[PDB]
Design a protein around this motif. Structure first.
Motif, PDB file in Angstrom:
ATOM      1  N   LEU A  11       0.986  -1.487  -0.388  1.00  0.00           N
ATOM      2  CA  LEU A  11       0.184   0.028  -0.058  1.00  0.00           C
ATOM      3  C   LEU A  11       1.081   1.499   0.020  1.00  0.00           C
ATOM      4  O   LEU A  11       1.249   1.986   0.508  1.00  0.00           O
ATOM      5  N   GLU A  38      -2.085  -5.572   3.848  1.00  0.00           N
ATOM      6  CA  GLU A  38      -0.760  -5.664   2.934  1.00  0.00           C
ATOM      7  C   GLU A  38       0.521  -6.342   3.506  1.00  0.00           C
ATOM      8  O   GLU A  38       0.762  -6.311   4.353  1.00  0.00           O
ATOM      9  N   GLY A  40       3.175  -5.437   2.987  1.00  0.00           N
ATOM     10  CA  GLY A  40       4.607  -5.033   2.884  1.00  0.00           C
ATOM     11  C   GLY A  40       5.333  -4.139   1.773  1.00  0.00           C
ATOM     12  O   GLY A  40       6.081  -3.604   1.837  1.00  0.00           O
ATOM     13  N   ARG A  47       5.456 -13.269   3.565  1.00  0.00           N
ATOM     14  CA  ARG A  47       4.446 -12.471   4.581  1.00  0.00           C
ATOM     15  C   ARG A  47       3.400 -13.248   3.700  1.00  0.00           C
ATOM     16  O   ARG A  47       1.967 -12.033   4.698  1.00  0.00           O
TER      17      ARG A  47
ATOM     18  N   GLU B 108       8.825  -6.137   9.559  1.00  0.00           N
ATOM     19  CA  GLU B 108       7.791  -5.345   9.035  1.00  0.00           C
ATOM     20  C   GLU B 108       7.349  -4.299   9.325  1.00  0.00           C
ATOM     21  O   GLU B 108       7.238  -3.327   8.542  1.00  0.00           O
ATOM     22  N   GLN B 111       9.212  -1.662   7.495  1.00  0.00           N
ATOM     23  CA  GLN B 111       8.581  -1.651   5.816  1.00  0.00           C
ATOM     24  C   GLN B 111       7.574  -0.973   6.404  1.00  0.00           C
ATOM     25  O   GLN B 111       6.274  -0.670   5.372  1.00  0.00           O
ATOM     26  N   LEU B 112       6.306  -0.537   7.713  1.00  0.00           N
ATOM     27  CA  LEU B 112       5.128  -0.848   7.300  1.00  0.00           C
ATOM     28  C   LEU B 112       5.245   1.241   7.746  1.00  0.00           C
ATOM     29  O   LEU B 112       5.249   2.262   7.103  1.00  0.00           O
ATOM     30  N   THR B 115       6.167   2.548   5.009  1.00  0.00           N
ATOM     31  CA  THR B 115       4.660   2.793   3.645  1.00  0.00           C
ATOM     32  C   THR B 115       4.072   3.146   3.738  1.00  0.00           C
ATOM     33  O   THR B 115       3.779   4.281   3.201  1.00  0.00           O
ATOM     34  N   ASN B 119       2.733   7.113   1.748  1.00  0.00           N
ATOM     35  CA  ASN B 119       1.380   7.656   1.933  1.00  0.00           C
ATOM     36  C   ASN B 119       1.683   9.115   1.622  1.00  0.00           C
ATOM     37  O   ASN B 119       1.217   9.805   0.992  1.00  0.00           O
ATOM     38  N   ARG B 213      -3.823   2.750  12.864  1.00  0.00           N
ATOM     39  CA  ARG B 213      -3.009   2.761  12.318  1.00  0.00           C
ATOM     40  C   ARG B 213      -1.205   2.295  13.416  1.00  0.00           C
ATOM     41  O   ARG B 213      -0.016   1.894  13.576  1.00  0.00           O
TER      42      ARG B 213
END
Lengths: 298, 269, 270, 295
Positions: A11, A38, A40, A47, B108, B111-112, B115, B119, B213
């Motif tokens: 995303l 998502e 990632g 994942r 993770e 990467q979060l 993202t 955005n 989030r």
């Protein structure tokens, strides 16, 4: 109140940030129960397999999957979801005769007609004889509908005309890697137009200004994004075929929401690609394309 | 007398045991450890019979006591060494397992935050593209507001995330370095760092863009915070090896001590 | 005759020596090295004298030939460990030195790119504040012009430098880890990642507009590239350690052969 | 085309980007060959030293120094620069009875008043008797700025609940702002430009905007755009840009045997949302689109 689990490959794009608005908005308009996971990233297959398995554990009746690879669940999908009916959302989901037994509906726009729509714009701007026009191709990597699918599409619409390809540069769709590709382009010299990814073009917009060649090289996108759009709105960009994303999302939601209420839904749906230009920006169509502002992925 | 016949063997075994424990110390898996243990067990059993026989060639109540002691210390020494190898293998597997888990989690998280960064930039383009249409209609009063946000929230958020993203990237690097960490000092440094850095991210994350989030992340940081044990386990692996070393040192010192006694016993014979 | 008291005195010094090398190989500085050296030197000289006596009492040629090699081999081995410990200390000090030099350089580069991130940031706020005056005087055509240069210039750059900072940061982190690297795998992994990140930055920075700063950044990256040897040097420490551990394992075997021969000499004489 | 070498403690600030514009601008007028170096951060005392040396090796006819610490060269300035003439810039440069032989001029404003202005603004708005007023001080690390604010409030109803100290980092100060927002016992936050700049965004997310008053103790493009939107109240400007021009003017004048005043110190100009004077802003903050220049 219905278990619908949407699995994106990520995303980060405005492309999916929009495909999002499409499933989201089309989820409160059908009152379903949609949760979004998502992966990632595209190289994050492991994942997605887990998020795919997570969907099931959550008890998803039908799940809309946007695979990080066509041949990823070709012989294993059921092995991660079971009897769950899958709905391809934006990418080709190649299943086996056995696995396929799960796919009930799938949306997806053949990109061939995106490259075609792009080449058609230039072949119509530079008809055979009009005068040899040297162009530069900055499509993207070397796989996900960024090559041969779009290429042959672009190639056809451009063949019988006076448009020559100086060359083509491949590279992942990272703004920086593309910027570098654009810069190399600006340095060549013979380049009239640059046709590439929304990523490439976005970079070209800043690079052509920073190098005072804003009005010396014409930018043609192979798809749309909130950046390529703003460029169209300011003549900084010439053309750009929109495959309406926001709507491409709604389509997938509906597909599963219908198969789960036994209503009629198009098995293999795909919106119609619309040509866009600096003034050809029909509101009704950009609404089924790029998400609103102030918005936020949910 | 015939003591010199046994005494030699003892000296021959002493040198084999010392060789066998080094073999054991090098065990890298459950099998190697087991076979090495096998040989070490036999060799040691032989050493005990010859020491016993060599004991009949004396009646000095004090001397045989010392002897029995040297024997005992050698027995305990080799057993502790074994315990040590057993742990070396346990801790290896366990740190690799726990570190792998953590890698996955912090990866993770990195990467979060990434993202969110992308955005937040896309929405900046939009929030501006909207200033355009808002301007043409001449609603200048709103265009004003739309600009204030673009700076107070839209622009200011871009920096906040860049920072968050640096912290998550830092964290991820620490975990990536952890699986092969053997320096006591460094292990503690990262440990202190990792802890403080998790505290900072626990609150800096609460103030992101979307609250839904700030949960996803707050959860990932909770999963990671619970995993901080791994650093103590890394120190435990450090101490275990340290002790293994010291024991092997004493092994030599324990044998030249045993033999020093078997010599005095082969004389007074 | 008295071959016994000799053969035993040897078989003991043998086990007494094995400890002196495991000590010397552990020394952590130049003072501790000298010490272990003497403790070992003494112990070795004794063993030698005692081997002369024990060796003079047996007129067996094939065995004396075996004893000369046995003793020589032991000597050769201890001479090598000695060298090994000199390299250990030399390397440790070279690594600490080279690594600190990179950390200062890398640190500067990090702060330098951080600065550009903060500037671009500020400048962006100043540029939006401008549009405020334009919008007041209702200079519509201009307002659009600035908005355009807020996206094509400020937003674009922000992301552009954020990454540059990220890379410079990623490099500092690698250097902070370098100092204590002892795992041959991890070392090579870090070594490859360092060179890749250095190539990318050398590239990215070059294309950056800031005149004076593009050079400074380039100067730091060149100085950093010239110090990459440290990874080779870190691998040499890996190697030196493996050798030391392997030498010490030979030590046992050797002193094992020595005693085996002296014992055969004892049996011959008596 | 005399060689003038300027050395700042850093260049992350709006404050210093501004001092910079001033020097670059001034240098262009004076017709001197300017060169700017930047220690990269107040802590980098060691790096500033090497830069002083770097100036000398360049053959600087004069050096405009923005010291990272007052006593940093108190006893050894001649050891880095040698005999080249030096000019103190924005911060107070303390030198020896042997070292002062080199200081040929100095610009700069005492931070004491920078805070005094803040104190008066608040005190002259909430006089003794009007009613109690609670404030949190986000003044950064852990003095002159403080002393002055304290001396300019002791005779009114301005109660200082507590001063949350921390480094001048947006994220660090942002956090301190958030805490204050939780004491629910605060009315006005008087802190650094950084603190204030963050506060504008945190309050906007807690609807406390029109609940907490922001009184900064110095200017920043962020704080100004805040006063211009009435989202900030006060702000004392020590005319950064002018301060920079002053030093280049001082030096070039010295090198050319011209008349100039040594201890030049601008007059602190107060600011509020209502009174935004166009001039004050140009002699205080770098222009739109201006980027740090070094030659």
């Amino acid at each position: 109140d219905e278990k619908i689990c949407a699995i994106y490959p990520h995303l980060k794009d405005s492309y999916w940030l929009s495909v999002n608005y499409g499933m989201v908005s089309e989820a409160e308009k059908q009152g379903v129960n949609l949760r979004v996971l998502e992966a990632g990233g595209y190289p994050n297959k492991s994942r997605q397999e887990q998020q795919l398995a997570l969907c099931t554990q959550w008890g998803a009746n039908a799940i809309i999957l946007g695979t990080v690879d066509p041949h990823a669940y070709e012989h294993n999908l059921k092995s991660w979801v079971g009897n769950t009916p899958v709905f391809a959302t934006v990418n080709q989901l190649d299943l086996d005769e056995e696995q396929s037994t799960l796919l009930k509906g799938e949306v997806g726009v053949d990109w061939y007609w995106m490259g075609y729509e792009a080449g058609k714009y230039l072949a119509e701007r530079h008809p055979k004889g009009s005068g040899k026009t040297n162009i530069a191709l900055l499509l993207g990597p070397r796989t996900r509908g960024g090559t041969k699918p779009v290429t042959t599409g672009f190639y056809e619409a451009i063949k019988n005309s006076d448009i020559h390809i100086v060359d083509s540069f491949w590279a992942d769709n990272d703004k920086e890697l593309q910027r570098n590709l654009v810069q190399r382009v600006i340095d060549m010299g013979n380049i009239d137009y640059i046709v590439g990814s929304a990523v490439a073009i976005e970079a070209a917009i800043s690079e052509l200004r920073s190098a005072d060649k804003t009005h010396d090289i014409g930018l043609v996108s192979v798809y749309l994004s909130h950046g390529v759009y703003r460029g169209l709105l300011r003549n900084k960009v010439l053309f750009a075929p929109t495959d309406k994303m926001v709507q491409q999302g709604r389509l997938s939601v509906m597909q599963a929401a219908h198969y789960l209420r036994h209503q009629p839904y198009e098995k293999q749906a795909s919106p119609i690609i619309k040509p866009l230009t600096p003034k050809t920006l029909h509101d009704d169509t950009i609404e089924e394309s790029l998400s609103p502002s102030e918005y936020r992925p949910t | 007398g015939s003591a010199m016949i046994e005494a030699r063997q003892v000296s021959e075994l002493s040198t084999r045991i010392i060789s066998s424990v080094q073999m054991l110390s090098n065990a890298q898996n459950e099998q190697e450890r087991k076979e090495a243990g096998r040989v070490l067990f036999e060799q040691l059993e032989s050493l005990l019979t010859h020491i016993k026989e060599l004991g009949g060639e004396s009646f000095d109540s004090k001397l045989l006591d010392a002897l029995e002691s040297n024997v005992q210390n050698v027995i305990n020494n080799l057993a502790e060494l074994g315990v040590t190898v057993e742990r070396k293998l346990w801790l290896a597997k366990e740190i690799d397992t726990r570190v792998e888990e953590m890698r996955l989690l912090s990866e993770e998280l990195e990467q979060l935050t990434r993202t969110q960064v992308q955005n937040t930039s896309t929405i900046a383009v939009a929030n501006v593209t909207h200033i355009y249409d808002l301007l043409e209609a001449n609603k200048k009063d709103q265009v004003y507001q739309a600009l204030d946000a673009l700076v107070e929230v839209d622009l200011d958020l871009t920096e906040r995330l860049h920072e968050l993203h640096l912290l998550a990237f830092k964290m991820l690097n620490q975990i990536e370095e952890a699986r092969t960490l053997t320096n006591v000092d460094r292990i503690q440094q990262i440990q202190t760092a990792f802890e403080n850095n998790l505290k900072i991210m626990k609150r800096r994350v609460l103030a992101v863009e979307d609250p839904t989030r700030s949960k996803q992340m707050s959860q990932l940081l909770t999963e990671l915070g619970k995993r901080q044990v791994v650093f103590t386990i890394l120190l435990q692996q450090y101490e275990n090896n340290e002790q293994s070393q010291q024991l092997m040192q004493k092994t030599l010192e324990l044998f030249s001590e045993l033999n020093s006694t078997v010599n005095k016993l082969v004389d007074d014979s």
